[PDB]
């Protein structure tokens, strides 16, 4: 249960002098999705590779997902799962020519049992606080009883890139940003929505936070996005 | 045809969103967008190390960029301006070596 953070905990986008379009890239209608798949191959101990061919463009036919530790990957190696996460190409390596390949972290959920019976999707409410006043709420939707934090994180930020220009090419409207999950069991964790200071953004590393393949009971988990501004 | 620029001639209006595509056939990781001006040799506006990546070069103001795929890297003028009226070159890079395209002249009325 990581405790709500304070200013000297959080990233300031004004401390970022690189291209925020590189942050944006990862949450603007950008995600590897696949329904019912089994590992086909493997690179390091802690990874799993799938045949998930690029939906939109033609940028990849194989997807490597890196998990937190070996046994985590074995946990899923030979399981019929569901994939969904934010993918990256710079510094994505995996010697199995012709590349046609992408990488990501965690993002793996068991297939069978984990879907809501009929049509029906579950709606998860996201409260957004901007400088404290809760100025907008919304809902993201899924189809898995047990949905990765990743997955609802990505949808949340995608909606916000659009409805609040969470991300832009050059910068962001907000100085700080973080996204808190609070579970029924009383558990809570938050992720920094902003890139570390400096004139470079490592996409590989930022996403690595999804290593844990953390999952959350969609039906009851809550979501809080807290946004801060400075100059107004 | 190692680098292809399109359109090779464009005529835009002041304050109009303008996009100049670049295709490379070698699949190099890095791509660059410059603009040629007399006495200015060739200045770098934005470059990219991969699908997804995009980085400010020396004169990135007034322009955005976009790496949809390994082949396409494009430059974008959010709101074209007379000042942005120049001739534009993109390259694809292998290492210490560049491969340029035929070039693109733009007029912003």
Per-residue HEC secondary structure of chain A comes to: CCCCCCHHHCCCHHHECCCCHHHHHHHCCCCEEEEEECCCECCCCCEEEECCCCCCCCCCCEEEEECCCHHHHHHHHCCCEEEEECCECCCCCCCCCCCCEEEEECCEEECCCCECCCCCCEEEEEEEEECCEEEEEEEEEECECEEEHHHHHHHHHHHHHHHCCCCCCCCCCCCEEEEEEECCCCCEEEEECCCCCECCCCHHHHHHHHCCCCEEECCCCEEEEEEECCCC
Cβ pair A18:B55 closer than 8 A: yes
Nearest to A68 by CA among A230, A200, A209, A187: A209
User: Which CATH number belongs to the domain containing residue A102 in this structure?
Assistant: 2.40.50.110
Q: Which residue has the tokens 């019976």?
A: A117
A82 is in an annotated binding site: yes
Q: Which of A5, A9, A27 is nearest to A201 (CA)?
A: A27
Residue B37, classed as helix, strand or coil, is coil
Q: Are residues A172 and A228 part of one domain? A: yes
Whether the CB-CB separation of B89 and B100 falls below 8 Å is answered with yes
**Of the candidates A192, A190, A136, which has an alpha carbon nearest to the alpha carbon of residue A164?**
A136
Candidates A20, A22, A202: best to mutate against B (most CBs of B within 10 A) is: A22
Structure tokens, A208: 């690595």
Q: Cβ A90–B56 below 8 Å, yes or no?
A: no
Beta bridge partners of A49: A41, A64
Q: Indicate yes or no: CB of A25 within 8 angstroms of CB of B27.
A: no
Indicate the residue among A112, A129, A155 that finishes a domain. Answer: A112
How many residues would you count in chain A? 232
Considering the domain architecture, whether residues A12 and A63 belong to the same structural domain is answered as: no
Token pair in block for residue A126: 């996201």
Indicate the residue of B52, B65, B69 with minimum beta-carbon distance to A203.
Answer: B52
Contact across the interface for A18 and B52, Cβ inside 8 Å: no
> Containing domain of residue A79, as a range?
31-112
Q: Are strands B104-108 and B9-12 parallel, antiparallel or unpaired?
A: parallel
First-to-last alpha carbon distance for chain B, in angstroms, is 31
- Return the residue in B30, B31, B53 with the most chain A beta carbons within 10 A, the one to mutate for interface testing: B53
Same domain, A80 and A141: no
Residues A88, A151, single domain; the answer is no
For tokens 């809902």, the residue is A139
In eight-state DSSP terms, residue B81 is -
Statement to judge: residues A201 and A166 lie in one domain: yes
Residues A24 and A104 in one domain: no
Strand partners, B11: B107
Q: Do B65 and A21 touch (CB under 8 A)?
A: yes
Query: Hey, what are B18's tokens?
Result: 């303008």
How far apart are the two ends of chain A, measured CA to CA in Å? 33
In the numeric block, which tokens belong to residue B107?
């007029």
Could you tell me if A145 and A219 lie in one domain?
A: yes
Residues A25 and A39 in one domain: no
* CATH number, domain containing residue A208: 3.10.20.120
Class (C level, CATH) for B1-109: mainly beta
Smallest Cα–Cα separation from A198: which of A5, A60, A13?
A13
Interface contact B69-A58, CB threshold 8 A: yes
- Order the strands of the A222-228 sheet from edge to edge: A133-142, A122-130, A222-228, A176-182, A188-192
Residues of chain A contacting B, Cβ within 8 Å = 18-19, 21-22, 25-26, 57-59, 88-91, 99, 169-170, 203
Contact B47, B68 (CB under 8 A): no
Q: Residue A146's beta-bridge partner residues? A: A217
CB atoms under 10 Å from CB of B21, counted, come to: 17
d(CA A200, CA B55): 8
Q: Looking at the 3D structure of chain A, how many domains does it have?
A: 2
Last residue of a domain, one of A92, A112, A132: A112
Distance from CA of B30 to the nearest CA of A (A): 10
Query: Exposed, middle or buried: residue B13 (CB in 10 Å: 0-12, 13-18, 19+)?
Result: exposed
- How far, CA to CA in Å, does B60 sit from each of A18, A156, B34, B56? 11, 30, 10, 5
Q: How far apart are alpha carbons A141 and A201 in whole angstroms?
A: 29
Q: B79 near B87, Cβ under 8 Å? A: no
Asked if A50 and A88 sit in the same domain, the reply is yes
What number of other Cβ atoms are within 10 A of residue B47's Cβ? Answer: 22
Are residues A15 and A38 located together in one domain of the fold? no
Q: What's the CA gap between A222 and A183, in Å, rounded?
A: 6
Indicate if A53 and A98 belong to the same structural domain: yes
Q: Where are the domains of chain B?
A: 1-109
Q: Are both A104 and A219 inside the same structural domain? A: no
**CA-CA distances (angstroms) from residue A22 to A12, A87, A177, A178?**
16, 12, 16, 18
């Amino acid at each position: 249960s990581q405790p709500d953070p304070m200013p000297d905990d959080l990233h300031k986008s004004s401390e970022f002098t690189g291209t925020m379009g590189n942050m944006k890239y990862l949450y603007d209608d950008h995600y590897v999705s696949a329904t019912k798949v089994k590992s086909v191959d493997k690179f390091l101990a802690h990874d799993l590779i799938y045949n998930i061919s690029d939906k939109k463009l033609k940028n990849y036919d194989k997807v490597k997902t890196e998990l937190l530790n070996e046994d985590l990957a074995k946990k899923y190696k030979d399981e019929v799962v569901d994939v969904y996460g934010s993918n990256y190409y710079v510094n994505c390596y995996f010697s199995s020519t012709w590349h046609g390949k992408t990488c990501m972290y965690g993002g793996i959920t068991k297939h069978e049992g984990n879907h809501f019976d009929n049509g029906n999707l579950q709606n998860v409410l996201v409260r957004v606080y901007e400088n404290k006043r809760n100025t907008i709420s919304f809902e993201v939707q899924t189809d898995k009883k047990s949905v990765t934090a990743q997955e609802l994180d990505i949808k949340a930020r995608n909606f916000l890139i659009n409805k609040k220009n969470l991300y832009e090419f050059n910068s962001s409207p907000y100085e700080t940003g973080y996204i808190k999950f609070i579970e029924n069991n009383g558990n809570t964790f938050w992720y920094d929505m902003m890139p570390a200071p400096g004139d470079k953004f490592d996409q590989s590393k930022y996403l690595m936070m999804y290593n844990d393949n953390k999952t959350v009971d969609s039906k009851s988990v809550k979501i809080e996005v807290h946004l801060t501004t400075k100059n107004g | 045809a190692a680098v292809t620029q399109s359109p090779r001639n464009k005529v835009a209006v002041t304050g109009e969103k303008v996009t100049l595509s670049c295709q490379q056939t070698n699949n190099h990781n890095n791509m660059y967008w410059y603009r040629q001006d007399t006495g200015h040799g060739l200045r770098l506006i934005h470059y990219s190390y991969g699908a997804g990546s995009t980085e400010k070069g020396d004169i990135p103001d007034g322009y955005k960029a976009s790496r949809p795929s390994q082949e396409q890297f494009s430059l974008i003028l959010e709101s074209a301006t007379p000042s942005q009226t120049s001739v534009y070159f993109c390259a694809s890079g292998g290492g210490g070596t560049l491969y340029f395209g035929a070039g693109t002249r733009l007029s912003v009325l």
